[PDB]
Structure formats: C-alpha cells, structure tokens
C-alpha cells in the first residue's frame, strides 16, 4: 500500500474496502 489523496467518492470507495460496506459514517459537513 501507499498514501494518496481520496476526495469525496474516493474516500467512500476506501471505507468500502476497509470495512466491507458494513456500516460506515464519514461525518459530511452540514454547513451551506
């Protein structure tokens, strides 16, 4: 493995691989 930028959908794709789609919540920003 190597460290890389993962913005937006790319972060969710990595949580998907790390957790196995089990139940993550990334705390997306609520501000307008």
């Amino acid at each position: 493995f190597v460290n890389q930028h993962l913005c937006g959908s790319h972060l969710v794709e990595a949580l998907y691989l790390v957790c196995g789609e089990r139940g993550f919540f990334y705390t997306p920003k609520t501000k307008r």
């Binding site: 460290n3 930028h5 993962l6 913005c7 790319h10 949580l15 993550f24 705390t27």
Partner: peptide, 21 residues
Amino acid sequence: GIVEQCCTSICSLYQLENYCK
C-alpha cells in the same frame, strides 16, 4: 474530519478504520 483531511492531504487505511461500524 477524514472527509476533508483525505481530500486536502494524503489519506491512510489506519485513519479510515475510525469511521467503520
């Protein structure tokens, strides 16, 4: 939070494991 940190800088699997349940 990881959703901004991994956009603005390089990410890690150790840091992402905090958000899984």
